[PDB]
C-alpha cells in the first residue's frame, strides 16, 4: 500500500505547514517546512497591523535552531474586512502591496498569505463587489511586483464551483502565487438540522457528506480550472465540527470525547483480536464485534459445529450475544454494521 | 468477503449457545439454539447437587415461548473436585451416570455438559490420577449408555497438546459425545509479568500471543486427533483478561475502559473520515491518524504541493502534527503504527 515519493514526482518536494493562531509556544519546528502566522488585519484607513505582534516575534525566533523554517503572515480570515476596497483601484492596490513589502522587510518574513474569504461574496458579513474576482488577480500582481519572486506568496481558498467562477481566476492567479492553500474543511459550517450532521472534510463522497462537497472534487475542480497540482496545499482541520453551531479542538476531543480513562484501543491484525494499552503497556485482552465476526467466519469457513460464549451474565445487554448470533445466522447484516465502525486502509 | 453457509456444509446447521453462570434474567432465547446452566457440583459422597436451583428452573421456563431451546446442565468447572474418583471404577461410573440420568429426568433437561478441568491434571487443585484419561472415555460411555442417543452430551476442554495426550482420548470420546466445547480462551490465566500481558483468545499467532497458544492451532490439534469439525463448538470469552491477576466482564469494560462519555467512534470507509455518534445521531466530524494518513497518501499519489493544518493551537501536544508530518516524510513508519491500531477485515 504505502506510496513513498511517487515515481512521476522525482521533482516536487512536498512540504508540511501549519497556521498558528494565538500563542505559538507548542509549535515543533522539526515537523514543519513552514509556519503561517494568523493574522495581520486591515484597519479603517487600509493600513496593515498585527493585533498580537509578540506571538509573531516568538514564532520568528524558531529560525534560531531551524534557519530553513519559512515564516509567513496570513492577512485576513473569516469576517476580515478591507480587501474589496484594497483591490478596487491602481492606488489602493499599490498602497496594499507597498505595506505587504514593508511588513515583510520589517519582520524579515519569508513571505505572505492572503486570506480573503471570499472575493465577490458578503457571506462572512464583509463588503463585496462583482469586480472583486478580476481585481483579486491585479492585487496579487501588485503584491508580486513589489515583494519579488524570492518571497512566498499564497492564497487561502476553496475548490467549490462558486469560488472558481465568482471569487478567483484560478488560471490567472496560478502563475503569480507559489501555493493555493486549499481550505478543504468546514463543509458543514453553513448548515443546521439534518444537513448539519454530515462530514466537514470528507476526502470522497458518501451518504454522510453534503451533495457536491468533498476534498477530491475541490482538488480536481482547481486542477481543471488551471491550478498546477504541485502548487495545491491540502488543508486538514485539527478541530471537530457538527454543523454551524459546535466546534471542538483536537485537545477538547482528546479530553471529553474519545479515550475512556486514558485506556487506548489497539488491534492485532495478525492475531485478529482487540486489546487495550495504558502508560506504554498492554493492559486488556477481550473480544469485540470485529474479532467475533472473524471467529464466527472461521466457524463457517472451517465447517465447525457452532459457537458459544462464557458467559451471558458478563454481557447483561446482550451486545456480544447479538454479534455472535448474527455472525453465524446472517453474517451479511453484521459485515454491513462493521463497515460503518472499523477504519479500513 | 462474508461467507453465508459454506457450499461444502449443505448439511451442518451451526448452533449458537451460552453458558449461563448466575441469575439468567437477561438471557435472550431468540439469539440462542442452546443454554448451558453452570453449574451442578459433586459432594463428598459422589452425589450430584445444584447449588442454586431457582436459576435453573427460571432458565427452563424460557422453553415456554421457545419450546425448541435446548437446556443443558454443566457439571464441574475450574477447581470442581470429584471427577477422578467418579471415573475410577465400574461402580463410581455406573453411580455417576445413574445420577446424571436422574437430574435429566427430574428437570426435563435436553442433556448434560461435563466440565472436568482437567483429567490427569491437578493444576486447579483437584485430585488427578494417570488413569484419568482412559477413565474419562469409560465415564462418558457409562453416561451415554443410560441417557440414550436422543440427549445432548458435551465435554468442555482445550485443544492444546497436553490435553490431547494427557487428558482425553479425542478419537475415542468423539463418537460418544454430540459436541466438544472448545474453551479457546484464558491462554494467559497461568502467566504474570511480561508473558502475562499477551492475548487470552488470539485466533492466529502474533508477537502479542503466547508461543503455542492460538484458537486455530486448538481447532487443528482436535481435528487431527480425530474430532470431527461439525462437533467442535468455538468458545468466545465475554470478559477481558490481563494475565492470571485481573479479569473484567464486557459490562465492566463498557463502563470503565472503552466508550468516553457515551460517545461512540464510527468510520465512513466511502468518505474515508472518522466521526462520532451519541443517542442514535451523528455527533462530531474530525480527522484522526487514519484519515490524515489517507489525506497525505492522496497528496503523494496526486502530485500535490504538500499539506497544512488549521491550526497548531488546537493540537498543543503535536499528535495530529506528527501524523501529518510523517504522512508526507516517512509514510512507511506511519502505516506500521496504524497496523497496530485499526481493525482490518
XYZ file of C-alpha atoms in Angstrom:
690
model
C 0.000 0.000 0.000
C 2.195 2.916 1.275
C 3.495 5.226 -1.617
C 6.967 6.839 -0.850
C 7.617 9.726 -3.357
C 5.520 8.760 -6.494
C 7.887 7.832 -9.428
C 6.372 10.676 -11.668
C 7.289 13.375 -8.994
C 11.131 12.930 -8.893
C 10.883 16.777 -8.880
C 8.205 18.065 -6.352
C 9.443 18.015 -2.699
C 6.078 18.208 -0.855
C 6.000 20.454 2.250
C 4.274 20.405 5.659
C 2.891 23.617 7.189
C 0.604 24.883 9.987
C -1.432 28.039 10.516
C -0.523 29.267 14.045
C -3.496 31.210 15.590
C -2.607 32.527 19.089
C 0.290 31.591 21.418
C 2.882 29.649 19.333
C 4.865 28.059 22.263
C 3.920 24.420 21.379
C 4.900 24.639 17.664
C 7.589 21.980 16.826
C 9.754 23.488 14.029
C 11.236 19.974 13.372
C 7.830 18.694 11.997
C 7.200 21.725 9.652
C 8.751 23.255 6.457
C 6.676 26.419 7.094
C 4.531 28.194 9.723
C 1.800 30.689 8.746
C 1.172 33.321 11.473
C -2.563 34.194 11.692
C -3.387 37.002 11.344
C -2.433 40.524 10.173
C -5.599 42.710 9.668
C -6.647 45.849 7.603
C -7.858 48.973 9.584
C -10.387 51.722 8.548
C -7.565 53.565 6.594
C -6.467 50.460 4.633
C -3.310 50.176 6.834
C -1.923 46.679 7.759
C -1.454 45.934 11.505
C -0.674 42.834 13.706
C -3.133 42.604 16.670
C -0.627 40.400 18.707
C 2.979 41.071 17.496
C 4.680 39.232 20.438
C 3.378 35.846 19.064
C 4.880 36.625 15.629
C 8.283 37.630 17.125
C 8.178 34.438 19.287
C 7.377 32.356 16.154
C 10.177 34.146 14.157
C 12.679 33.106 16.875
C 12.173 29.371 15.887
C 14.545 30.247 12.953
C 17.386 30.262 15.551
C 17.607 26.416 15.747
C 15.954 25.849 12.262
C 17.154 28.676 9.922
C 15.447 26.947 6.891
C 11.948 27.278 8.532
C 9.727 29.583 6.420
C 7.706 32.142 8.432
C 4.648 33.523 6.604
C 1.994 36.045 7.724
C -1.611 35.482 6.717
C -3.662 38.675 6.197
C -7.417 38.315 6.705
C -9.544 35.309 7.724
C -13.278 34.737 8.153
C -15.110 38.114 8.574
C -11.847 40.158 7.962
C -12.975 43.375 6.148
C -10.937 45.603 3.799
C -9.934 43.507 0.755
C -12.690 44.620 -1.740
C -11.668 48.307 -1.060
C -7.911 47.403 -1.249
C -8.396 45.617 -4.592
C -10.618 48.325 -6.237
C -8.120 50.894 -7.815
C -4.477 51.127 -9.039
C -3.904 53.315 -5.887
C -5.445 51.005 -3.187
C -3.589 48.058 -4.944
C -0.172 49.877 -4.990
C -0.746 51.011 -1.332
C -1.687 47.469 -0.128
C 1.301 45.918 -1.947
C 3.729 48.611 -0.523
C 2.522 47.785 3.050
C 2.901 43.997 2.441
C 6.531 44.545 1.341
C 7.038 46.835 4.372
C 5.754 44.180 6.830
C 7.976 41.532 5.056
C 11.150 43.732 5.368
C 10.244 44.910 8.939
C 9.860 41.324 10.384
C 12.305 39.598 7.931
C 9.331 37.385 6.832
C 9.799 34.671 4.158
C 6.544 35.997 2.672
C 2.782 36.425 2.885
C -0.513 34.504 2.645
C -3.754 36.272 1.526
C -6.981 35.114 3.273
C -9.814 36.983 1.517
C -12.945 34.966 2.486
C -14.143 35.457 -0.161
C -13.821 37.811 -3.164
C -17.271 38.505 -4.704
C -19.122 37.234 -1.578
C -20.544 39.008 1.526
C -21.289 35.650 3.289
C -18.867 36.492 6.218
C -20.533 39.987 6.538
C -17.711 41.836 4.611
C -18.028 44.172 1.578
C -18.110 42.500 -1.891
C -18.360 43.830 -5.477
C -18.829 41.980 -8.826
C -15.306 43.205 -9.914
C -13.651 41.517 -6.806
C -12.727 38.462 -8.973
C -10.766 40.287 -11.706
C -9.499 42.764 -9.049
C -8.031 39.892 -6.930
C -5.664 38.989 -9.815
C -4.454 42.624 -10.111
C -3.961 42.857 -6.304
C -1.811 39.652 -6.352
C 0.055 41.067 -9.416
C 0.731 44.321 -7.453
C 2.000 42.289 -4.394
C 4.249 40.033 -6.550
C 5.639 43.099 -8.479
C 6.882 44.653 -5.124
C 7.952 41.606 -2.944
C 9.766 39.842 -5.877
C 9.959 36.149 -6.997
C 12.190 35.085 -3.997
C 9.316 35.528 -1.438
C 6.401 33.187 -0.734
C 3.008 34.399 -1.860
C -0.028 32.149 -1.221
C -3.831 32.485 -1.260
C -6.262 30.649 1.032
C -9.399 29.486 -0.835
C -11.832 26.606 -1.553
C -12.192 24.395 -4.653
C -16.008 24.644 -4.891
C -17.807 25.817 -8.108
C -18.864 29.240 -6.686
C -15.185 30.066 -5.782
C -13.817 29.052 -9.238
C -16.479 31.084 -11.186
C -17.203 34.065 -8.774
C -14.117 34.558 -6.453
C -10.869 33.876 -8.370
C -9.390 33.498 -11.872
C -7.592 30.221 -10.979
C -5.695 30.158 -14.329
C -4.660 33.879 -13.969
C -3.527 33.749 -10.235
C -1.805 30.322 -10.765
C 1.477 31.710 -12.260
C 1.592 34.668 -9.752
C 1.365 32.670 -6.454
C 3.652 29.927 -5.026
C 0.794 27.961 -3.385
C -3.021 27.803 -3.242
C -3.898 26.794 0.361
C -6.982 24.644 -0.242
C -9.261 25.017 2.825
C -10.742 21.525 2.364
C -12.808 21.672 5.627
C -15.838 23.444 7.215
C -18.124 21.803 4.535
C -20.956 21.969 7.231
C -20.138 25.498 8.660
C -23.318 26.930 6.945
C -25.793 24.033 7.782
C -28.114 23.264 10.813
C -30.700 20.453 11.440
C -30.415 17.289 9.248
C -27.797 18.613 6.716
C -25.706 19.905 9.705
C -24.893 16.314 10.895
C -22.624 15.418 7.909
C -18.788 15.345 7.361
C -16.908 18.713 7.325
C -13.790 17.328 5.425
C -14.837 14.068 3.582
C -11.965 13.101 1.213
C -14.529 11.356 -1.166
C -18.394 11.397 -1.416
C -20.656 9.138 0.809
C -24.181 9.080 2.456
C -22.856 11.285 5.318
C -21.384 14.179 3.202
C -23.118 17.234 1.628
C -24.057 16.580 -2.049
C -21.209 18.332 -4.006
C -18.675 18.932 -1.150
C -15.598 16.644 -0.994
C -11.787 17.287 -0.771
C -11.157 15.286 -4.027
C -13.740 17.295 -6.069
C -12.064 20.584 -4.791
C -8.597 19.388 -5.865
C -9.966 18.255 -9.301
C -12.038 21.499 -9.761
C -8.886 23.624 -9.049
C -6.703 21.395 -11.346
C -9.152 21.589 -14.348
C -9.548 25.438 -13.853
C -5.723 25.579 -14.441
C -4.070 25.343 -10.934
C -0.935 23.127 -11.228
C -1.150 20.146 -8.826
C 2.318 20.972 -7.193
C 1.014 24.426 -6.006
C -2.031 22.936 -4.178
C -1.590 22.511 -0.370
C -4.223 20.188 1.126
C -5.747 21.619 4.329
C -6.631 19.345 7.305
C -8.727 20.583 10.282
C -7.238 19.896 13.802
C -10.732 20.540 15.179
C -14.106 18.725 15.017
C -17.364 20.310 13.756
C -21.118 19.442 13.951
C -22.941 21.929 11.641
C -22.658 25.748 12.022
C -23.217 25.551 15.820
C -20.482 23.485 17.571
C -16.667 23.099 17.095
C -14.068 21.385 19.334
C -10.231 21.461 19.225
C -8.497 18.049 18.888
C -7.269 18.696 22.512
C -11.017 19.043 23.564
C -11.968 15.712 21.770
C -8.836 14.038 23.359
C -10.325 15.027 26.787
C -14.191 14.887 26.520
C -14.956 12.510 23.527
C -12.558 9.604 22.513
C -10.184 7.844 25.051
C -12.000 6.446 28.198
C -9.962 6.806 31.497
C -6.740 7.083 29.353
C -7.254 3.474 28.023
C -6.356 3.354 24.300
C -7.965 0.822 21.857
C -5.385 -1.238 19.807
C -5.779 -4.153 17.282
C -3.501 -7.123 16.402
C -4.357 -7.737 12.673
C -2.071 -10.885 12.714
C -3.722 -12.263 15.970
C -7.164 -10.923 14.736
C -8.230 -9.759 18.299
C -8.653 -6.344 20.058
C -6.648 -5.167 23.118
C -6.084 -2.022 25.276
C -2.867 -0.093 26.196
C -2.359 2.472 29.028
C 1.014 4.133 30.030
C 3.039 2.330 27.254
C 1.874 -1.181 28.357
C -0.582 -3.877 27.094
C -3.488 -3.606 29.614
C -6.510 -5.794 28.474
C -7.330 -8.771 26.105
C -11.024 -9.287 25.122
C -13.320 -9.923 22.084
C -15.396 -7.084 20.447
C -17.764 -7.096 17.423
C -14.927 -7.437 14.825
C -12.987 -10.366 16.483
C -16.467 -12.095 16.992
C -17.323 -11.547 13.283
C -13.846 -13.037 12.392
C -14.262 -16.010 14.879
C -17.822 -16.718 13.500
C -16.325 -16.531 9.931
C -13.716 -19.182 10.987
C -16.651 -21.363 12.211
C -18.409 -21.138 8.835
C -15.325 -21.425 6.551
C -13.925 -24.402 8.634
C -17.264 -26.409 8.940
C -17.308 -26.268 12.821
C -20.455 -27.151 14.854
C -21.193 -23.610 16.098
C -20.065 -21.099 18.706
C -20.711 -20.475 22.444
C -19.835 -17.731 24.997
C -18.661 -17.764 28.610
C -20.953 -16.255 29.837
C -24.341 -14.365 29.222
C -24.006 -12.911 32.824
C -20.965 -10.799 31.693
C -22.965 -9.232 28.781
C -26.286 -8.247 30.500
C -27.341 -6.026 27.493
C -26.711 -8.969 25.002
C -24.394 -6.791 22.828
C -21.741 -9.545 22.323
C -24.508 -12.231 22.211
C -26.236 -10.413 19.272
C -22.906 -10.064 17.349
C -22.176 -13.806 17.973
C -25.755 -14.847 16.907
C -25.766 -12.644 13.742
C -22.116 -13.744 12.995
C -23.484 -17.323 12.482
C -27.104 -16.660 11.276
C -26.854 -13.522 8.982
C -23.163 -12.630 8.521
C -24.045 -10.140 5.680
C -26.021 -7.946 8.185
C -23.096 -7.884 10.703
C -20.455 -7.063 7.985
C -22.667 -4.042 6.864
C -22.781 -2.950 10.593
C -18.929 -3.121 10.967
C -18.271 -1.337 7.559
C -19.746 1.707 9.433
C -17.418 1.366 12.521
C -13.944 -0.039 11.580
C -11.447 2.127 9.666
C -10.069 0.251 6.607
C -6.907 1.355 4.658
C -15.811 -11.284 1.915
C -18.779 -12.537 4.051
C -19.354 -16.406 3.746
C -23.095 -17.440 4.166
C -23.307 -21.270 4.739
C -20.107 -22.673 3.016
C -21.093 -24.713 -0.137
C -19.398 -27.942 1.312
C -21.646 -27.781 4.506
C -25.141 -28.083 2.872
C -25.577 -30.459 5.876
C -24.224 -28.901 9.187
C -26.640 -26.319 10.727
C -24.226 -24.468 13.075
C -25.633 -23.524 16.513
C -25.237 -20.619 18.964
C -25.054 -21.252 22.723
C -24.152 -19.542 26.028
C -23.006 -20.785 29.424
C -25.295 -19.048 31.979
C -23.437 -18.596 35.346
C -25.712 -16.934 37.959
C -29.038 -15.078 37.515
C -30.356 -15.874 33.985
C -32.938 -12.995 33.700
C -31.133 -11.204 30.793
C -30.764 -14.320 28.565
C -32.488 -13.736 25.145
C -33.754 -17.175 23.982
C -34.283 -15.708 20.440
C -30.446 -15.356 19.912
C -29.560 -18.934 21.134
C -30.126 -22.583 19.983
C -28.984 -23.742 23.457
C -28.240 -22.507 27.004
C -25.812 -24.352 29.314
C -26.645 -23.843 33.030
C -23.436 -23.588 35.126
C -23.037 -25.482 37.347
C -24.106 -28.755 39.029
C -21.391 -29.974 41.519
C -20.238 -33.337 43.124
C -20.357 -33.604 47.005
C -18.137 -35.689 49.403
C -20.362 -38.814 48.726
C -20.150 -38.526 44.910
C -23.780 -37.223 44.797
C -24.782 -34.554 42.174
C -26.405 -31.331 43.511
C -27.365 -27.843 42.106
C -26.106 -25.034 44.432
C -28.751 -22.533 43.006
C -31.757 -24.491 41.576
C -34.042 -21.396 41.209
C -31.780 -20.075 38.349
C -32.087 -23.422 36.515
C -35.917 -23.509 36.902
C -36.033 -19.841 35.718
C -33.837 -20.759 32.697
C -36.017 -23.880 31.964
C -39.098 -21.597 31.796
C -37.643 -19.900 28.604
C -38.943 -23.078 26.813
C -42.474 -21.610 27.258
C -42.087 -19.072 24.379
C -39.242 -21.067 22.611
C -40.007 -24.827 23.036
C -37.073 -25.734 20.658
C -34.488 -24.101 23.045
C -32.096 -26.774 24.405
C -31.384 -26.520 28.162
C -28.164 -28.250 29.274
C -26.549 -28.540 32.733
C -22.781 -28.328 33.022
C -21.258 -30.384 35.872
C -17.921 -29.128 37.201
C -15.806 -26.095 36.238
C -12.423 -24.769 37.356
C -11.466 -26.268 40.788
C -14.604 -28.581 40.848
C -13.479 -31.790 42.677
C -14.910 -35.322 42.350
C -14.402 -36.474 38.733
C -11.178 -38.590 39.169
C -12.991 -40.579 41.973
C -16.227 -40.796 39.862
C -14.297 -42.114 36.838
C -12.138 -44.687 38.762
C -14.321 -47.931 38.956
C -17.283 -49.629 37.174
C -19.295 -48.724 40.366
C -18.431 -44.959 40.650
C -19.015 -44.746 36.799
C -22.455 -46.515 36.947
C -23.408 -44.366 40.024
C -22.359 -41.059 38.339
C -24.202 -41.968 35.112
C -27.399 -43.008 37.079
C -27.405 -39.577 38.850
C -26.889 -37.711 35.515
C -29.936 -39.511 34.046
C -31.862 -38.752 37.270
C -31.090 -34.996 37.070
C -32.056 -35.048 33.306
C -35.464 -36.745 34.026
C -36.089 -34.633 37.205
C -35.629 -31.210 35.424
C -36.719 -32.395 31.905
C -33.216 -31.319 30.673
C -32.239 -31.708 26.980
C -28.949 -33.111 28.310
C -25.637 -32.574 30.075
C -22.190 -30.978 29.650
C -19.118 -32.384 31.511
C -16.565 -29.778 32.734
C -13.661 -31.800 34.177
C -10.775 -29.257 34.287
C -8.825 -31.363 33.621
C -8.469 -35.175 33.631
C -4.870 -36.186 34.522
C -4.049 -32.702 35.936
C -4.138 -31.231 39.490
C -3.497 -27.649 38.184
C -6.902 -26.381 39.584
C -6.081 -28.059 42.990
C -8.316 -31.168 42.333
C -7.358 -34.883 42.539
C -5.775 -36.437 39.390
C -4.510 -39.946 38.507
C -2.583 -41.230 35.426
C -5.651 -43.431 34.512
C -7.979 -40.298 34.367
C -7.542 -40.168 30.536
C -8.697 -43.723 29.719
C -11.224 -43.495 32.611
C -12.827 -40.331 31.091
C -13.835 -42.349 27.984
C -15.467 -45.075 30.144
C -17.301 -42.428 32.246
C -18.713 -40.809 29.039
C -19.594 -44.341 27.763
C -21.465 -45.025 31.069
C -23.361 -41.647 30.772
C -24.284 -42.240 27.085
C -25.410 -45.872 27.851
C -28.001 -44.530 30.439
C -29.230 -41.141 28.960
C -29.564 -42.557 25.370
C -28.714 -41.106 21.891
C -31.640 -38.547 21.956
C -29.972 -36.399 24.713
C -27.137 -33.888 24.357
C -23.826 -34.923 25.847
C -20.872 -32.498 25.566
C -17.416 -32.087 27.138
C -15.672 -28.778 27.868
C -11.928 -28.917 27.064
C -8.943 -27.224 25.346
C -7.141 -28.112 22.091
C -3.589 -27.794 23.492
C -1.002 -30.659 23.237
C -1.118 -31.563 26.983
C -4.963 -32.032 26.811
C -4.831 -34.241 23.657
C -2.045 -36.540 25.057
C -2.739 -36.474 28.896
C -6.480 -35.558 29.462
C -8.677 -37.135 26.746
C -8.740 -39.799 24.009
C -10.146 -37.364 21.390
C -10.702 -40.183 18.827
C -12.419 -42.437 21.476
C -14.754 -39.725 23.037
C -15.564 -38.259 19.547
C -18.296 -40.828 18.617
C -19.792 -40.818 22.197
C -20.401 -37.025 22.585
C -22.537 -34.605 20.492
C -20.148 -31.632 20.916
C -16.660 -30.770 22.218
C -16.949 -27.258 23.751
C -13.530 -25.827 22.878
C -12.576 -23.352 25.653
C -10.452 -21.242 23.279
C -9.725 -18.512 25.917
C -7.800 -17.910 29.199
C -4.472 -18.509 27.285
C -2.844 -16.088 29.893
C -4.705 -17.375 33.063
C -1.421 -19.031 34.319
C 1.059 -16.144 33.461
C 2.260 -12.968 35.368
C 4.901 -10.276 34.497
C 5.953 -9.985 30.795
C 4.208 -13.185 29.479
C 1.011 -12.099 31.368
C 0.460 -9.072 29.023
C -0.423 -11.153 25.900
C -3.747 -12.180 24.193
C -6.042 -14.656 26.058
C -8.006 -15.754 22.866
C -5.834 -14.910 19.753
C -7.477 -16.584 16.704
C -3.981 -16.842 14.974
C -0.343 -16.394 16.228
C 1.343 -12.896 16.542
C 4.016 -11.009 18.648
C 1.411 -10.464 21.427
C 0.306 -14.144 21.931
C 1.930 -16.966 23.984
C 4.201 -19.172 21.792
C 1.968 -22.247 21.036
C -1.472 -20.901 22.173
C -3.964 -19.867 19.445
C -7.660 -20.758 18.713
C -6.750 -22.065 15.182
C -4.000 -24.435 16.485
C -6.556 -25.832 19.087
C -9.163 -26.485 16.370
C -6.499 -28.133 14.100
C -4.987 -30.173 17.030
C -8.503 -31.517 17.920
C -9.321 -32.221 14.199
C -6.044 -34.194 13.553
C -6.515 -36.182 16.877
C -9.850 -37.372 15.312
C -12.566 -34.854 16.485
C -14.967 -34.215 13.544
C -15.103 -30.480 12.690
C -19.011 -30.362 12.993
C -18.821 -31.420 16.720
C -16.408 -28.575 17.673
C -18.080 -25.502 19.296
C -15.786 -22.452 19.291
C -15.756 -20.671 22.676
C -15.600 -16.834 22.908
C -14.932 -15.004 26.224
C -17.423 -12.163 27.120
C -14.803 -10.929 29.597
C -11.330 -9.327 29.322
C -8.161 -10.722 30.972
C -4.626 -9.382 31.745
C -2.562 -12.387 32.994
C -3.612 -14.558 35.993
C -4.401 -11.465 38.135
C -7.179 -9.306 36.575
C -10.455 -10.077 34.678
C -13.341 -7.748 33.701
C -16.846 -8.537 32.348
C -17.738 -6.935 28.971
C -20.254 -4.813 31.026
C -17.236 -3.594 33.188
C -15.157 -2.685 30.015
C -18.312 -0.963 28.522
C -18.317 1.261 31.685
C -14.642 1.810 32.793
C -12.477 1.179 29.614
C -13.828 1.835 26.013
C -16.603 4.458 25.245
C -15.800 8.032 26.562
C -18.899 9.951 27.936
C -21.157 7.601 25.829
C -19.596 8.962 22.548
C -19.091 6.068 20.088
C -16.316 6.094 17.393
C -17.615 5.402 13.796
C -15.864 5.400 10.337
C -17.140 6.218 6.804
C -14.935 3.932 4.585
C -16.512 5.558 1.422
C -15.903 9.174 2.756
C -12.531 7.986 4.301
C -13.004 10.128 7.521
C -13.820 9.376 11.223
C -16.944 10.603 13.094
C -18.763 10.153 16.465
C -22.377 9.079 17.298
C -24.282 9.514 20.621
C -28.023 8.644 21.242
C -28.600 7.336 17.635
C -27.313 10.586 15.998
C -24.147 11.755 14.127
C -22.406 13.988 16.744
C -18.848 15.026 15.524
C -16.749 15.254 12.256
C -12.916 15.470 12.623
C -9.625 13.968 11.275
C -7.626 11.294 13.250
C -4.381 9.421 12.407
C -6.018 7.184 9.719
C -7.884 9.954 7.735
C -4.564 12.028 7.933
C -2.566 9.024 6.603
C -5.195 8.694 3.761
C -5.177 12.523 3.030
C -1.295 12.538 2.988
C -1.448 9.464 0.634
C -3.766 11.488 -1.707
C -1.122 14.295 -1.649
C 1.646 11.901 -2.721
C -0.339 9.826 -5.284
C -1.849 13.040 -6.878
C 1.459 15.111 -7.053
C 0.110 17.965 -4.791
C 2.441 20.600 -3.230
C 2.074 19.432 0.394
C -0.312 19.626 3.334
C -1.140 22.170 6.095
C -3.316 22.218 9.269
C -5.662 24.770 10.824
C -4.244 25.139 13.448
C -1.235 24.062 15.731
C -3.060 25.811 18.699
C -5.822 23.101 18.602
C -3.226 20.252 18.885
C -0.944 21.500 21.748
C 0.703 18.005 22.140
C 1.506 17.871 18.319
C -0.236 14.454 17.952
C -2.026 15.355 14.657
C 1.020 17.441 13.537
C 3.333 14.367 13.901
C 0.887 12.121 11.932
C 0.637 14.829 9.189
C 4.483 15.295 9.073
C 5.230 11.513 8.999
C 2.323 11.016 6.470
C 4.376 13.122 3.962
C 8.018 12.413 5.072
C 8.057 8.653 6.093
C 4.670 7.109 5.214
C 6.055 3.539 5.841
C 6.615 4.388 9.577
C 3.027 5.751 9.983
C 1.412 2.724 8.176
C 3.324 0.348 10.621
C 1.928 2.499 13.543
C -1.718 2.229 12.264
C -1.430 -1.588 11.503
C -1.255 -1.839 15.358
C -4.425 0.312 15.982
C -7.050 -0.109 13.178
C -9.046 -3.352 12.882
C -8.915 -4.718 9.292
C -11.327 -7.431 7.939
